[PDB]
Design an enzyme around this catalytic site. Sequence first.
Site, PDB file in Angstrom:
ATOM      1  N   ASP A 232      44.175  35.224  45.180  1.00 37.96           N
ATOM      2  CA  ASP A 232      42.864  35.602  45.733  1.00 37.96           C
ATOM      3  C   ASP A 232      42.473  34.649  46.865  1.00 37.96           C
ATOM      4  O   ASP A 232      41.941  35.051  47.906  1.00 37.96           O
ATOM      5  CB  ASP A 232      41.772  35.448  44.658  1.00 37.96           C
ATOM      6  CG  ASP A 232      41.617  36.673  43.762  1.00 37.96           C
ATOM      7  OD1 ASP A 232      42.430  37.624  43.848  1.00 37.96           O
ATOM      8  OD2 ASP A 232      40.666  36.665  42.946  1.00 37.96           O
ATOM      9  N   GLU A 503      32.541  43.915  38.589  1.00 35.01           N
ATOM     10  CA  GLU A 503      33.011  44.962  39.492  1.00 35.01           C
ATOM     11  C   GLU A 503      32.549  46.319  38.969  1.00 35.01           C
ATOM     12  O   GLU A 503      32.837  46.685  37.818  1.00 35.01           O
ATOM     13  CB  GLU A 503      34.541  44.894  39.641  1.00 35.01           C
ATOM     14  CG  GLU A 503      34.987  43.635  40.405  1.00 35.01           C
ATOM     15  CD  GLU A 503      36.398  43.181  40.062  1.00 35.01           C
ATOM     16  OE1 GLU A 503      37.005  42.454  40.887  1.00 35.01           O
ATOM     17  OE2 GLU A 503      36.902  43.540  38.974  1.00 35.01           O
ATOM     18  N   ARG A 519      32.777  46.184  34.992  1.00 34.62           N
ATOM     19  CA  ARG A 519      33.512  45.149  34.267  1.00 34.62           C
ATOM     20  C   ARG A 519      32.553  44.096  33.711  1.00 34.62           C
ATOM     21  O   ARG A 519      31.586  43.724  34.377  1.00 34.62           O
ATOM     22  CB  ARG A 519      34.478  44.496  35.253  1.00 34.62           C
ATOM     23  CG  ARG A 519      35.204  43.273  34.759  1.00 34.62           C
ATOM     24  CD  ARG A 519      36.131  42.791  35.858  1.00 34.62           C
ATOM     25  NE  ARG A 519      36.713  41.497  35.536  1.00 34.62           N
ATOM     26  CZ  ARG A 519      37.644  40.906  36.278  1.00 34.62           C
ATOM     27  NH1 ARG A 519      38.108  41.502  37.386  1.00 34.62           N
ATOM     28  NH2 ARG A 519      38.119  39.725  35.910  1.00 34.62           N
ATOM     29  N   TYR A 615      44.059  46.539  38.434  1.00 35.24           N
ATOM     30  CA  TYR A 615      43.097  47.190  39.326  1.00 35.24           C
ATOM     31  C   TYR A 615      43.595  48.576  39.700  1.00 35.24           C
ATOM     32  O   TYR A 615      44.810  48.813  39.781  1.00 35.24           O
ATOM     33  CB  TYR A 615      42.895  46.376  40.598  1.00 35.24           C
ATOM     34  CG  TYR A 615      41.919  45.231  40.452  1.00 35.24           C
ATOM     35  CD1 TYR A 615      42.027  44.323  39.392  1.00 35.24           C
ATOM     36  CD2 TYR A 615      40.904  45.039  41.379  1.00 35.24           C
ATOM     37  CE1 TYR A 615      41.147  43.255  39.265  1.00 35.24           C
ATOM     38  CE2 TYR A 615      40.014  43.967  41.264  1.00 35.24           C
ATOM     39  CZ  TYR A 615      40.143  43.078  40.214  1.00 35.24           C
ATOM     40  OH  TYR A 615      39.252  42.016  40.099  1.00 35.24           O
TER      41      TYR A 615
HETATM   42  C1  LIG Z   1      35.001  36.327  48.657  1.00 32.58           C
HETATM   43  O1  LIG Z   1      35.960  35.727  47.842  1.00 32.58           O
HETATM   44  C2  LIG Z   1      36.265  36.264  46.590  1.00 32.58           C
HETATM   45  C3  LIG Z   1      35.737  37.491  46.200  1.00 32.58           C
HETATM   46  C4  LIG Z   1      36.044  38.011  44.941  1.00 32.58           C
HETATM   47  C5  LIG Z   1      36.891  37.292  44.079  1.00 32.58           C
HETATM   48  C6  LIG Z   1      37.235  37.858  42.722  1.00 32.58           C
HETATM   49  N1  LIG Z   1      38.534  38.477  42.620  1.00 32.58           N
HETATM   50  C7  LIG Z   1      38.896  38.629  41.187  1.00 32.58           C
HETATM   51  C8  LIG Z   1      40.284  39.230  40.934  1.00 32.58           C
HETATM   52  S1  LIG Z   1      40.981  38.912  39.352  1.00 32.58           S
HETATM   53  O2  LIG Z   1      40.092  39.375  38.284  1.00 32.58           O
HETATM   54  O3  LIG Z   1      41.208  37.477  39.267  1.00 32.58           O
HETATM   55  O4  LIG Z   1      42.279  39.659  39.253  1.00 32.58           O
HETATM   56  C9  LIG Z   1      37.435  36.076  44.467  1.00 32.58           C
HETATM   57  C10 LIG Z   1      37.121  35.559  45.730  1.00 32.58           C
END
Ligand SMILES: COc1ccc(CNCCS(=O)(=O)O)cc1
Length: 658
Positions: A232, A503, A519, A615
């Site tokens: 991420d 989400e 979620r 996802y």
């Molecule tokens: C803007 O920066 C961000 C925006 C959202 C997120 C979250 N993403 C989660 C995905 S997971 O559940 O870990 O598979 C992380 C950084």
Amino acid sequence: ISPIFQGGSYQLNNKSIDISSLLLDKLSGESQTVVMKFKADKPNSLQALFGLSNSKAGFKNNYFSIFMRDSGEIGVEIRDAQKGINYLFSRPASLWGKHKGQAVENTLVFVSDSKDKTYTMYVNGIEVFSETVDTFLPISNINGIDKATLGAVNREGKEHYLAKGSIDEISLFNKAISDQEVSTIPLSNPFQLIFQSGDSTQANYFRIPTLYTLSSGRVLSSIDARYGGTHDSKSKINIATSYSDDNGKTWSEPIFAMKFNDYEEQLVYWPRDNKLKNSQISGSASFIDSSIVEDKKSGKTILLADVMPAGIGNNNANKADSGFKEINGHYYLKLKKNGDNDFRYTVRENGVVYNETTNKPTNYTINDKYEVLEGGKSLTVEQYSVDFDSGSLRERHNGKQVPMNVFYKDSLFKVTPTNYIAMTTSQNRGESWEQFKLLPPFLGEKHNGTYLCPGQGLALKSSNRLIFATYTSGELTYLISDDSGQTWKKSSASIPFKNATAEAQMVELRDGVIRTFFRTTTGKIAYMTSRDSGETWSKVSYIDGIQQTSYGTQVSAIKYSQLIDGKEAVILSTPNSRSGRKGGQLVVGLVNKEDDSIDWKYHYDIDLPSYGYAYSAITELPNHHIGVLFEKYDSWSRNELHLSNVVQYIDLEINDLT
Ligand SMILES: COc1ccc(CNCCS(=O)(=O)O)cc1
């Protein structure tokens, strides 16, 4: 160039099949190719499909095997005790089990190449590993090999790794067939790839799929093109899009909806070993999490995504600041200059960089592309490239100049290191995208920005209203536009969770009635309802009958256009499991008109309960089939990071689901 052995219709029912007489004397030279078409819809926990072994006492570690696990992982072992060699190469999430209730024929090609000293494994037209070694071990050259076996490995006279499944076809070649020859082997795939390694994005990894059916019948998809492994953050990520004009059968070469240029778009093989797998591209600006909607009135397609500057860092960056300054009910983007220790600048009207100490404007302006201009002249920075040549990640200047952007590490002026929301539009249904604009703060000057819910926005059917769901601590924050996305307002909806990744995706049950599924951290999917087209929101309830993990997974949702069993129907896509991201399901709910309650009546298993599913994106295709684009692996698991071509697309009919 013929096989030295070809056999078929083998049933592996926890009883190995001896093909030694048929195969062993045919094996010759040091390069071999194994082609195998097999099904395993009820695999054992760990099973070998094929083995060549020294079956004698004291030589239990002298064998070659092709094995799989009930997690979908494929691998080989290549072991010779006398040579002191114990090779194991594998990759999680490489297999299909079932599609539409029927066992999937996986096509496996394993190439053992003595000349390049390289072992390469393909499954279903996808290269899942390619490993070069200093000391090559030909699979036929293991000391004292005396058994060729299907559905187990014979060690010291006993059946190890007993398999359940079938091998409808197995061929062997005394040659390492070329990558090109591999590409001509027919496949029986249940899926297709829209985005994939080596395409126009040049990202080796992809996450966060979206799907949306446009009014012209074109189906549009967006996705995170992820360059620095599947991380991420920190990373380099662009937002790519592709479309289909034939109900999902074929898809356009991807283009970018949102991209930064501070780091080169490089196709990189991210290390998966425990020492290096957490390496992160740390100096790149990035996007993450996209969402799509179509506006009836202008006909425009709108795409939003989170934006992060290079200076971003998880926690302490930047909760407690929006990155904007309020001056007269208007919000202005803050900027810090090279060498200052605070943010002493703002981007006022027409990109003019003002100095907040002296209220004097500067000779610097910011253009539409968030690029820095001095006296009207385009400033540049030098691009970075990354490599693991030194045995660890390096990020270094590469000689190429690119426009200076306020989101970049090397920029004269930098935005606040926090998360923003960007919006772009297309007037040609995804053939090109505008330069993005930042959305304003919604929760105030001091609140950091909300987080975009990836997937679809909602275009209300009976008006011009557009809604994008976002989340933050303690609430969902819906973004509402009634003017084709020119202006937005928020609608706050309290939820009983702090710091949750809530989400959320929405469906319109009937005109002006929105149900949002989201979620949570409780192990169950939640929902709330609005009956005034998003102005106000109900309290939170939970769905029983579907399980998620404590940390949860994104849920995608649509209102199906056709009645099912005489009722309005909603379709949800989600893992169904309290252990990990696996057991993918489409769940069909029927609406009860008495109270808008939903009876979750049909569960369609996408593939095995133990096979990965994370996802997801779903859309009703113009022909009323259902399109599903999804992460076919466990995108939480620390063991399944940095896999290529696991985001896959399938076509389903409603009758498949019921
Ligand atoms: C803007 O920066 C961000 C925006 C959202 C997120 C979250 N993403 C989660 C995905 S997971 O559940 O870990 O598979 C992380 C950084």
